[model samples]
Target: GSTSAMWACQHCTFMNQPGTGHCEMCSLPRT
Candidate 1:
């Protein structure tokens, strides 16, 4: 699940902030 300002990571399931370019918790691509 994801909100307007946050997106869930598919690799580690971490909620990432906007413009992160990648998952801060899992180091995976946000796309």
Candidate 2:
């Protein structure tokens, strides 16, 4: 088995780490 994670900001098109709270590019809050 394998596992992976991803994050996308709803306010903007920003990609973030798995355990991130805010988007570095857009500065949006991630859930």
Candidate 3:
């Protein structure tokens, strides 16, 4: 699932803010 305000991190399955370009939990770059 995707949305305008957030993205799901594939590395950690964590929800991240749209302004971020990486996963906060695993530090994986957004893909």
Candidate number with greatest lDDT: 3
For candidate 2, write residues 1-31 as lDDT tens digits: 2226767788878767776678777776785
Candidate 1: what lDDT?
Answer: 0.77
Ranking by lDDT: 3, 1, 2
Which pairs clash in model 1?
Answer: none
- Model 3 bad stretches (over 4 Å): 1-4
Q: What's the TM-score of each model vs. the native? A: 0.59, 0.47, 0.67
- List the candidate 1 regions with Cα displacement exceeding 4 Å: 1-4
Task: State the C-alpha lDDT per candidate.
Answer: 0.77, 0.72, 0.83
lDDT at residue 20 of model 1 (Cα atoms):
82
How much lDDT does candidate 3 score?
A: 0.83
Task: Identify the superior model by TM-score, candidate 1 or candidate 2.
Answer: 1
Per-candidate alpha-carbon RMSD to the true structure: 4.0, 3.6, 3.9
| Model 3 lDDT per residue over 1-31, tens place | 4656888887789889887878789987887
